[PDB]
Amino acid sequence: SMTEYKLVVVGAGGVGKSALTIQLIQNHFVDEYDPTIEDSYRKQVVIDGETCLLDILDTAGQEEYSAMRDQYMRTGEGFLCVFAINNTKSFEDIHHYREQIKRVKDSEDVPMVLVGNKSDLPSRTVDTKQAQDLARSYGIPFIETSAKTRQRVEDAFYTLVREIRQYRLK
Ligand SMILES: Nc1nc2c(ncn2[C@@H]2O[C@H](COP(=O)(O)OP(=O)(O)O)[C@@H](O)[C@H]2O)c(=O)[nH]1
Ligand SMILES: O=S(=O)(Nc1nc2c(O)ccc(Cl)c2s1)c1ccc(O)cc1
Ligand SMILES: [Mg+2]
Query: Residue 122 class from Cβ within 10 Å (0-12 exposed, 13-18 middle, 19+ buried)?
Result: exposed
Cβ of 57 less than 6 Å from ligand 1: no
Q: Hey, which residues does 43 pair with through a beta bridge?
A: 54
Expt. technique: X-ray
Which distant-in-sequence residues (6+ apart) come within 8 Å of 155 by Cβ?
143, 145
Give the pocket of ligand 2 (CB within 6 Å): 6, 8, 38, 40, 55, 57, 68, 71-72, 75-76
The radius of gyration of the chain's CA atoms, rounded to the nearest angstrom, is 15
Domains (ranges, CATH) in the chain? Answer: 3-168 (3.40.50.300)
Q: Hey, which residues does 121 pair with through a beta bridge?
A: none
CB 47 within 8 A of CB 161: yes
Q: Ligand 2 centre from 39 Cα, in Å?
A: 8
The resolution in angstroms reads 1.3
